[PDB]
Amino acid sequence: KHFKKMFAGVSSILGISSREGEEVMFKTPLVEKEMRVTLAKLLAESVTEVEIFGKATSIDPNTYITWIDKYQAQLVVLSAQIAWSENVETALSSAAPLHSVLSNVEVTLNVLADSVLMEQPPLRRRKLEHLITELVHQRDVTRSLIKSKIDNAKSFEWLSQMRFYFDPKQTDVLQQLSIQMANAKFNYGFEYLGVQDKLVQTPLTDRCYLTMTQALEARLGGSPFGPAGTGKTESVKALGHQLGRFVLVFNCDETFDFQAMGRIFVGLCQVGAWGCFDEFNRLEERMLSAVSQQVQCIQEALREHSNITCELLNKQVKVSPDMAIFITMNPGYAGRSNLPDNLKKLFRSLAMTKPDRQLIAQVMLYSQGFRTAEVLANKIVPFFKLCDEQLSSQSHYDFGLRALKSVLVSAGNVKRERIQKIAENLPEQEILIQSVCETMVPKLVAEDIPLLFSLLSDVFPGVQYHRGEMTALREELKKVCQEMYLTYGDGEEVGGMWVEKVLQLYQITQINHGLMMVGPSGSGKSMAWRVLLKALERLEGVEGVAHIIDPKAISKDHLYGTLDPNTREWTDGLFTHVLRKIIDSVRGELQKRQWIVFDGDVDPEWVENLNSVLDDNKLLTLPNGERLSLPPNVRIMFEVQDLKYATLATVSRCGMVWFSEDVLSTDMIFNNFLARLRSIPLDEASPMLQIQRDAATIMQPYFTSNGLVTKALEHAFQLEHIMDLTRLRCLGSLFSMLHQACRNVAQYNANHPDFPMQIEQLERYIQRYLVYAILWSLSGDSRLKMRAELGEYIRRITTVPLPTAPNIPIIDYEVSISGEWSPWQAKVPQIEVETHKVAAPDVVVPTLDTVRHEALLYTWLAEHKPLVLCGPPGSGKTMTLFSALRALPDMEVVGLNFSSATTPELLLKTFDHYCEYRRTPNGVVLAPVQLGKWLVLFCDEINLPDMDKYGTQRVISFIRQMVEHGGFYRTSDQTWVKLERIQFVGACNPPTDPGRKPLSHRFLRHVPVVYVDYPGPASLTQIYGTFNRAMLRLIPSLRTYAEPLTAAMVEFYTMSQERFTQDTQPHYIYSPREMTRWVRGIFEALRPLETL
Amino acid sequence: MESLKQIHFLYQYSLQFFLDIYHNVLYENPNVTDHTQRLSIITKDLFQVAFNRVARGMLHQDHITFAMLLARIKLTYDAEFQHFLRGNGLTVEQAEAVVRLSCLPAFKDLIAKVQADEQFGIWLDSSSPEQTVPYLWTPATPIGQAIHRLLLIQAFRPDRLLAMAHMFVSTNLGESFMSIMEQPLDLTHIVGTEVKPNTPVLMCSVPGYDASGHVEDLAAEQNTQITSIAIGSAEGFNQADKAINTAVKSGRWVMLKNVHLAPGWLMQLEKKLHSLQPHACFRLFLTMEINPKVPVNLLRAGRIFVFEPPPGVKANMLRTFSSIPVSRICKSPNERARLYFLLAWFHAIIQERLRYAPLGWSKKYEFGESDLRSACDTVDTWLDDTAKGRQNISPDKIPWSALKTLMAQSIYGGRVDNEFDQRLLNTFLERLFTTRSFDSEFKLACDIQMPDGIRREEFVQWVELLPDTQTPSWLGLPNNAERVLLTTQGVDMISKMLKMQTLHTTASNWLHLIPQTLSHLKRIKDPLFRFFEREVKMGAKLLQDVRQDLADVVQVCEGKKKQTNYLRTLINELVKGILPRSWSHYTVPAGMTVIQWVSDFSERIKQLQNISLAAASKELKNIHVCLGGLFVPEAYITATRQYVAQANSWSLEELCLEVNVFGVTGLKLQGATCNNNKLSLLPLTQLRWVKQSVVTLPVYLNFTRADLIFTVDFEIATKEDPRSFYERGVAVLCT
Ligand SMILES: Nc1ncnc2c1ncn2[C@@H]1O[C@H](COP(=O)(O)OP(=O)(O)OP(=O)(O)O)[C@@H](O)[C@H]1O
Ligand SMILES: Nc1ncnc2c1ncn2[C@@H]1O[C@H](COP(=O)(O)OP(=O)(O)O)[C@@H](O)[C@H]1O
Ligand SMILES: Nc1ncnc2c1ncn2[C@@H]1O[C@H](COP(=O)(O)OP(=O)(O)O)[C@@H](O)[C@H]1O
């Protein structure tokens, strides 16, 4: 196993195996030296064998094919440059022989292009496609040489090509072969590179090889740059292949210390390997100079060798001459740093800003077996350019060279599948349309789909495609979807768009190793991949395992792991341990389909550490030199909202699936809610189930098509709130309130066992509860005037009976269990507080706002769902919440405050103090210390966690992970910990207040928010008149002055609040707690005198 | 001297160096034993050394600010001297300066004397009016006449305000006063006598250049060991501490690179060193980048030098010839010197082309002495391979093609990304590096004669035989490219000398009128109509967003509450004039302020109103638009191409474009003019998508030339060279 990660890219070690399957054997019956001598003697035989028919005027198919099958992938291609270069050197030394060599190349290309039209095994087919790629390079270079007249080998036009010299008389078999270039003279490494994947040798890529060949002839490094996804790392790999030394690819992040690159350079030097460092735009500015020191010091010893030891981490160690360093930047993007100027002095820089898409689209498509690949490429490349230029400016599109390579490999897969389904002619223009529909169509928004299909109709006239159906998977989705109370569609029904998106996601998953989702919150991403995984596990019989990691909430050291600087010790992170357990296969994880999902938002500091696992040769690097080869059967996924803060270095690597908000309409949410209500009992046929089913039968007419709830909801988006309204939160709050309605009916049946609930009264209760719940779920987080306007609209829509009060809004009514309206003035009697409780903590003067809010908070805390209370300072969120809790003798509170520099460690310490851990067969459960007694976490300031650079708080992400999955990851043992009896209630001031930021929608979906406003002159006068009457009992003679005193202060507080506010100073906060201090002062002044 | 820290923010001045001026002048200045002549020598040399000590540690564009002030110190003219520092077919902008100068008694003749002379028109259009100036005002001294014609030339041609300053200093302080700046830096002498121990050698680097190699070259030159440790790591910090202690003990050379990255340890070094008494000839070198991070105390202490691309074509060849050692350039064959001179000349051309950007090279690529060093190594290797064992080689046997390819692709062309810049580099390398370069009458530019030597010695005197009257025509770029920069320097003189000598109310008035200027926009498978509807949709949406934002600003400024978050941010970006990110949804030039945004937006909304009228009325083919006023001109081009393809049932690939002078208006052409489709060195453009000695000119939305969108094939007049149109920089501009 360990050879997969350090020694080249072979699989395991009689001979050396490989991932694709081809195995070498030892000639002679010390890992490095033996396998190089074996390879050299093989090439010595191969050159002599191929020079027999080097003048390939007529080629025997049998001998040629068995020569392909006899030898290895790297040797055949290499021996196809050796013979070429010797033949052309002989011809140009003596233009008839040059034309003869061109004809030989053409004949060889024709015989190899005839083979792909016949069925071939993939093992030979990969080598044969590589040979087509090489021989197209040969034919294009030879026709370039003949196009511009040349006379001798000393002309630069021949001199600047990858010419391969073979010396049969060389005793040193390792020095038997050489390669030349403009001023260069190398020796081929003869490492068992293996097959890998040979590139297309375009003119831009030709400049790319030439500049670094010149750099490496001298003692410098190579620094490709430019926009991402143009072939930098793969170009360095191409140099490694063409010069015979495997290049170690290292992705670089801020986690590196100087000691890590110290051992990287020591490891490179002690064996004589090559390094390709992917990132020097995020490795820290000072650290760039700190490593410039070392990379400058090594080059001096290299030049001394050119005219042996060097210092590396204060140690004199030997340096082999066969060493090379190449780098890569991705300059110009926002989320990156600059470079020191001295580093650039050591490095040659070449720009990849326009790769030749035409010839790469041509040659490999032609090698796959397409008869008319020329016209197909000529039509598809400008289609890509047109798509790039004309489509709308969406930050999540990716039409670079990676997208083209994926599209054409998908076309090859489609061709193979259609051949197996059915020889000489199979409409090839339709194959590209099918590939584009499989890969490119899913990631478009609904606006741009007609544009893309118009392009497909224009640049590819005719050959109109008919969408296929995977009826087996679709019926499996029928059988699995209904189990979890989810709706299904036929592609044209109300739920067809969503299932079509699931099928598109399956298609992207089959071809793209890296997968990703984008769309607004609450459009069905999680449910979609969950049902897809369950259906896949039920269909193929392979167990489906899903891991979820939220990377934004977790610190980067805990997520990826971190090296201990005092003594180099590698503590693993989350993803590191996940990969270690999959690779080690302790339980049998290699035989199971295992997905890793990354929910949460995107941020460049962590997504781009995965750039080394989403490329070819998928492999993760760590600072300690430990390397992890990625499993074949796993898939790395993202479930994110938007990409307003992501770069194209990772947005292009991963196949994409886009969900619009209209994919998941309202009717399917209604159907899911009603199915869950009918089937699963609320308390956990029972009486609860009967009540649920009766209520669902009552309410079904209101939860379909337009009805009432949808009319109300689309009328509500024209009314402002504290913050941006979302549909799915607005429906979840309603669903919880309806669950409480069912519980209340159960309470009523418990009150009268001899008189069960009657249906005729049950309707009068439940339609009334529906209108009340619609009101408080759609206008909970809004002003009172918004509540009045929505009350009027809800009155107009529906026939639910309503109060006859001419000027009382419907929001100000209670729905009685008797099944009728009641004013809220019945539950707020004028009470007189005691003499010693005139002004005390935890005292509530009842008013209609307070009792209404108490009822609502009771309803949401009864179901044990999270909650948020937000309004201007002084509204009474704290005391109202505590009053709601005081009526509930089953939950206690833990006060908790978030600072602007707070961390999840605050909540972790609170849990360690107030809760405990225990290991159950189900896993790890975090339990409150009091059994059966609910433990609430009150967060007095929820909207001021630490605000990250890219618009996503950390603690908000942590609470989101708490709420959605009911748990988190404990980093001491990096394990899954789930909550038992903890619900989260929070409070804030409005985000429009100055220092407070707006709250993320993906977390705002889970939690409902209620607006609590300061009472104002209507209720403050009553409250503090009650306090003044209770306070002027210390002095009996002053009781007549209680009323005119209250009207005074309440006026002045009204006169002073409008004048002084935050516009002048930051802390000009006016609250009714100023009135609390008022009455406290007057009471504590009038208490002991007894006569004024 | 001291009060320049309020201008540069890079040079910090102390009393110790000003007393070092006396320590050098009064004890080491050569000379006579006569008091009056000695006083004259000391006074004359004080200004020279005061400029020489200072100007080596500051930017070139300020070298004229300090020296001209030193012309005042040595300098009755103060009454009229303040006029040009506080005063602010003739054109209006020149007429304003003329009338403002006419207020002085000394320039009362400007009222009538400007029209009597018929040679004034020729003088105004002259290539260099600094040499001769008409006098318009008791015979005056040469200094007084210089001041008078300084005021006059600013009043007439402010673009030539800078150049006159250079001669005015020579009127007072001497012709050879500034000549030592245009020479290589004598590092060895300065470290020999002008830099004491306990005084770090500060080396500032403008971005794109450095001075790390200079100290290593010095260390190899003097045959001394040196310890070099960079800045940025704790291990490096400790090794640097050990190195500085050992060097203090033993007198060794110590070298620190990029100390601007760690101001803590750097601030510690000043107090570590000032309280220390080290060995003789102990020198620490610090290299840094110009930024407001380095501790000011360390700048007060050390010896500051500024390293950058030197001005002028002349100085670059001296710097290059000093950089290459004498032995290498004189090695056989004798044509090696010829190729070295050609390489140095080409390097000077490209590096001075960078300065006049974007008109010469659109992207400011970085080019330094590493590129020149690698090119020289390549030339040496090629000549070793070609001319082994021979003393004389012919021009034809020189590998011209290989050298041209390698300079065009790897060494210098690797940093070139745009295709147009690559083809321009090819144009240079083909024009200069050829067998014609060895003819006696070869021309480097069109005039300048190449020297006809064979050794390094005779080339040297010709470099400084080049006249100081330099114009961009030496490069190929039009001379008018000076007018953008020279004026930018002229206003840099008056401003930098002047330092040397509620919000709601504003915003409410600012946005009372802006709604009045702006307007309102009214909203099957036709390729033109779909993209036009998308354009109108985006325009209407963003216009509504802007209108709502401005309404909110008006309401919060008037006092109608709305004291919210994200509106005070708009107040800040509206008062400061920075374009907020809430509105930058398409490409605009950097630094483009809000008033220009509204001026552009009004015309854009008017155009989209006309588009809506045309679409509502099809007639969408005969509508005329101006590119740049469209959010995505690429979309318009693609829609036109697809409309033609669908009209004629052609494949979208097989449809190329031809241009004639579909209607496109509002375009502009810079650098040339055209009448009959032949470009002579655009009221309406006709575009015809046709099936299947011209020049490919680009089109850019903004004058910055960031990203290209479109190319046009244009014919050329018979009297002009196709290659020169790449050099000159003719371009199509949408603004
Ligand atoms: N096709 C569907 N039909 C009905 N209800 C659905 C469907 N898909 C999802 N839901 C319901 O929508 C709610 C959220 O769905 P899901 O978790 O899949 O959303 P999401 O897109 O992953 O969310 P987010 O992006 O906000 O984290 C759950 O009630 C789920 O049952
Ligand atoms: N010449 C080429 N031949 C084959 N594939 C190429 C070639 N150039 C680029 N590609 C493809 O384009 C992608 C470029 O990836 P990479 O160079 O790593 O981008 P970046 O340098 O931005 O990380 C690769 O997936 C590669 O397969
Ligand atoms: N409706 C009300 N009835 C009685 N007292 C109230 C009411 N609203 C506010 N108060 C009093 O004024 C205080 C307002 O401050 P409060 O909103 O509780 O602080 P916070 O800013 O932490 O939410 C309350 O604590 C309470 O003592």
Swiss-Prot record, chain B:
Segments carrying the region annotation (AAA 6) are 165-381
Cellular compartment(s): Cytoplasm, Cytoskeleton
Query: Taxonomically, which superkingdom?
Result: Eukaryota
Task: List residues, modification Phosphoserine.
Answer: S322
Name positions with the PTM N6-acetyllysine.
K443
User: What domain comment accompanies this record?
Assistant: Dynein heavy chains probably consist of an N-terminal stem (which binds cargo and interacts with other dynein components), and the head or motor domain. The motor contains six tandemly-linked AAA domains in the head, which form a ring. A stalk-like structure (formed by two of the coiled coil domains) protrudes between AAA 4 and AAA 5 and terminates in a microtubule-binding site. A seventh domain may also contribute to this ring; it is not clear whether the N-terminus or the C-terminus forms this extra domain.
Any idea what job this protein has?
Cytoplasmic dynein 1 acts as a motor for the intracellular retrograde motility of vesicles and organelles along microtubules. Dynein has ATPase activity; the force-producing power stroke is thought to occur on release of ADP. Plays a role in mitotic spindle assembly and metaphase plate congression.
What does the sequence similarity comment in the record state about its family?
Belongs to the dynein heavy chain family.
User: What disease is mentioned for this protein?
Assistant: Charcot-Marie-Tooth disease, axonal, type 2O: An axonal form of Charcot-Marie-Tooth disease, a disorder of the peripheral nervous system, characterized by progressive weakness and atrophy, initially of the peroneal muscles and later of the distal muscles of the arms. Charcot-Marie-Tooth disease is classified in two main groups on the basis of electrophysiologic properties and histopathology: primary peripheral demyelinating neuropathies (designated CMT1 when they are dominantly inherited) and primary peripheral axonal neuropathies (CMT2).
Assembly notes: Homodimer. The cytoplasmic dynein 1 complex consists of two catalytic heavy chains (HCs) and a number of non-catalytic subunits presented by intermediate chains (ICs), light intermediate chains (LICs) and light chains (LCs); the composition seems to vary in respect to the IC, LIC and LC composition. The heavy chain homodimer serves as a scaffold for the probable homodimeric assembly of the respective non-catalytic subunits. The ICs and LICs bind directly to the HC dimer and dynein LCs assemble on the IC dimer. Interacts with DYNC1LI1; DYNC1LI1 and DYNC1LI2 bind mutually exclusive to DYNC1H1.
Protein name (Swiss-Prot/TrEMBL): Cytoplasmic dynein 1 heavy chain 1
Q: Which organism is it from?
A: Homo sapiens (Human)
Q: Which residues of the full protein are shown?
A: 3815 to 4645 of 4646
